Design a protein around this ligand. Sequence first.
Ligand SMILES: [K+]
Ligand SMILES: [K+]
Lengths: 581, 581
Amino acid sequence: SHMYYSYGNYEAFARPKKPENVENKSAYLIGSGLASLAAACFLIRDGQMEGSKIHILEELPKPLKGYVVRREMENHFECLWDLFRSIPSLEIDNASVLDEFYWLNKEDPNYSRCRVIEKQGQRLVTDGDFTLTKTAIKEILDLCLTNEEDLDDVKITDVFSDDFFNSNFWIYWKTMFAFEPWHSAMEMRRYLMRFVHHISGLADFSALKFTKYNQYESLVLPMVEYLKSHGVQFEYDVKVEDIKIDVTTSQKIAREILIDRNGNAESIKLTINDLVFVTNGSITESSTYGDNDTPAPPTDELGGSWTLWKNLARQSPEFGNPDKFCQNIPKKSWFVSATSTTNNKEIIDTIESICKRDPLAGKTVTGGIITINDSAWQMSFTINRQQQFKDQPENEISTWIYALYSDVNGDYIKKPITECSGNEICQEWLYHLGVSTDKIEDLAKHASNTIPVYMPYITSYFMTRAIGDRPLVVPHQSQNLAFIGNFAETERDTVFTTEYSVRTAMEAVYQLLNIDRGIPEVINSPFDLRVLMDAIYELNDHQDLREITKDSKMQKLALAGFLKKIKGTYIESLLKEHKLL
Amino acid sequence: SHMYYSYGNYEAFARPKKPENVENKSAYLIGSGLASLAAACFLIRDGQMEGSKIHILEELPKPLKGYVVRREMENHFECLWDLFRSIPSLEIDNASVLDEFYWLNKEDPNYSRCRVIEKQGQRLVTDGDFTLTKTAIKEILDLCLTNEEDLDDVKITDVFSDDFFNSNFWIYWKTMFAFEPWHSAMEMRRYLMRFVHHISGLADFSALKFTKYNQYESLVLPMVEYLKSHGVQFEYDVKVEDIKIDVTTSQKIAREILIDRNGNAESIKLTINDLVFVTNGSITESSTYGDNDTPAPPTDELGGSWTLWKNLARQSPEFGNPDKFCQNIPKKSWFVSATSTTNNKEIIDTIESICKRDPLAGKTVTGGIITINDSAWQMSFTINRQQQFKDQPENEISTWIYALYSDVNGDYIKKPITECSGNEICQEWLYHLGVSTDKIEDLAKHASNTIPVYMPYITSYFMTRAIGDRPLVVPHQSQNLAFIGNFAETERDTVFTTEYSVRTAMEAVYQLLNIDRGIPEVINSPFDLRVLMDAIYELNDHQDLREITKDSKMQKLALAGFLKKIKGTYIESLLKEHKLL
Ligand SMILES: [K+]
Ligand SMILES: [K+]
């Protein structure tokens, strides 16, 4: 009740008055992920909180055998662009991160010239088409017409049938977003509605936008410099074990942060004027690393992030249900990603022959993942603009590889990916590029350096869930406690996105400080009739309403009577404008 | 083809690169109205044109007997807020005009406590309700469903019948926007679609927002100071008589500006790199002024603005058809407005008794016009926050009065308003406030000072028109010539608004300089299903779909079958959210 949603330039460009009594308030942010950093930025810029009163608590201190790549953006990351228009670029003078990003993606717009391959390097013949049947389209629409409240614990396989899963649409969708068939239909529905304005860019990634470098260099480092320039305090080697919260009949008040500061057990006592921002849960927690000759050791370890959320959930069911997300994760789930770095011309030339661009040119390369449709692992890989690390040699590329299925033997390396060294993952990948099999072993072992990473929780955002499993950003009656990040709850936005991190941060800061400025709503595209007309046209692989209805009597007649009632009206002009007539 | 429309924060917050070759370009803006000033501001900020190369050409030089008041804003003036977030306030340090305006309208939000009066000072009993019948509602919707291309030269009386014109809706609508029954149905349609998101605020003005002072002090003066601080050149006593334009088979190029600079006939020769921004036509041209004892003398004079547009239209029909707007204006049209200033407690107390607020308190007073429904003149009046001039005595108010009908005897002063002195207009107004008739003459003649103004073209924006009567902002193949202001043509936006002035200015500058940043589209509210649901609910005076259909078989049955097919779905939840179920 302490915020309101808005849209349009009035609320975008307006500045909030300094919030009431902020001069006597402090902030503690648990973890240094994007959501914590964003919340600190809003605390500085819009809360006008004093930097020395803002404390970022990081578990790690202030050696992997190679480069490791970790996601993209779209124009309607409304909250994220509100943030980064205020963060100075570290690459361009007198320019924001938004400016640098905006100009770069106009100079070198992202698109894919090859989205799906099969048969050891051949482009899928129907690449670019959705190959959705009428039944599959109806299931998509029926899911969207289902209330979110009726999708508690429903799996994607509960709402779609064979036609949909055989479609190219599902190939594009599951791989670009990392949906597994057992994942949350509720989240899949949110994604369908959230990105409906970009349906025309699904097959070719033409709606995706990327930073110049990896996320740490292009997003985190600029935020850090901004926060440091305003005196914000960074606390390393601090493990938050619990937060004692009073949950009374009238209020929720965080009372004390129980920490281990460099082996020493200490405690931070809080008043109502000391705000606590918890990033509950983590998809990168407990990650392990291999090298070119060693697999990343599988693990089920619960780290500090999941232990902390469990300790908060013990104090109120309003603080969420972490076990839905970190327990009972199927062993087929995506766990392993790998970064394969090479300067070898044979590999780089093979990539060029598939993606149609020079990987070393410094512009778009694959334009997003290429999916190997017939790979047992259901592997995809991408090469961003190179190099993605500013100190990497200019003759090197780093390729990011991931597998949706973790418990199935590969086609060339006949083992599950979880049993594979870096070079074995690279060999399986090189096989599917069409590299001659008598060269694969040496090119992977001696011409490349591949670092695998095992992430027990990388699919955790998407686990089947029920309303209530995620805490509200500001739980009911909370006075000084907020939850931020991709396991907190807010309307219609989609998790596994950087936008969701910034949105929850902004909503938390605005609500706890009662900031008198609107939060931009999730973009209104699923309510926009023009966008919905485009979606019907795109989903039906570019067929007008007559062609859609051509083989059915019940519809071909309803359409005849509809066209007779709209003839010569604005509705007919709109349908013609959007190619439905 | 030299611009694109956008929405959302990405394009709002992004800055355009410096446009190509702007260092060798100059700009001439004809007139110093809002559109010219806005275009100069965009030339500085986004064109990065040198201030000394920007020339504002004003006909007047660098004595009325009293104060003269001249409109409001809404949140979705998308282009105007893009502009004024960059203009420094002259009232608050380190703040924009947008900030000052945003904070003021949150501190003192606008609303009316009395919108319509009758019978010499009594509130209309049904004030607040639209009193629209089903037939009237159907005509509203049928107009919106008509293509704009089918409304050439159609009058409002061609598309509405008796029920609509007897509605409270039409009272609110015609007076707040100054529509006459013979005005353009095309523009009325644009207004219905343009402001559909504010239908719930039509009766009480709760969607209106106002500057602190009159428009000159709160909008023009800040822009002027901004332009002067950047070296922009202001040219006074310059009358533009013509612009010689080459209209070839391949290009339109302005060649020379023919001027009279202080009685001297001179000429400004232009290259392709010299841009010309013409504000074609004017609603204030040829205005005459009276005083407390003298009517403003009626006139049909064509001034420099209308002569110039006629001289441009002689060179291409693509430059518009001014005669549609400045000729054959019916003599019943609104011509006269008056500003009545008083410090008299009897008058001020009578106003307080009607509007329910202290006129001298410095906050909202009437919250917008009060309409005298049974006045022969169809008179309305408003009192903004006082005082509206920063050097006015603190015990004074200034009331703005206007009459939609100019050729009908008044109820107390039995003469058309065009024959009335300032004090006679005030007397007619005081009669309709319920002032005792034995006091009206002395309170108007000796306790008030009323300045009338006769404006032959004040209704000119709304004259019946056809596609093509207004020039495109940048006509086809124009290299260096643009048209801006409320007689230029752009999609869906509404004239008689300051937003239209800023929009045309922005579109002209962006197109002529090929600026690489989106222009915000007219707000998408008529395509937003949520907004349309609200509109149905509001237009039907807050009745759900069952009550709307209760007295009809064809609809009450179609609704039964519709409800049976949407039961338990998201569509039903949406309808319930918006009170239609
Ligand atoms: K905002
Ligand atoms: K924009």
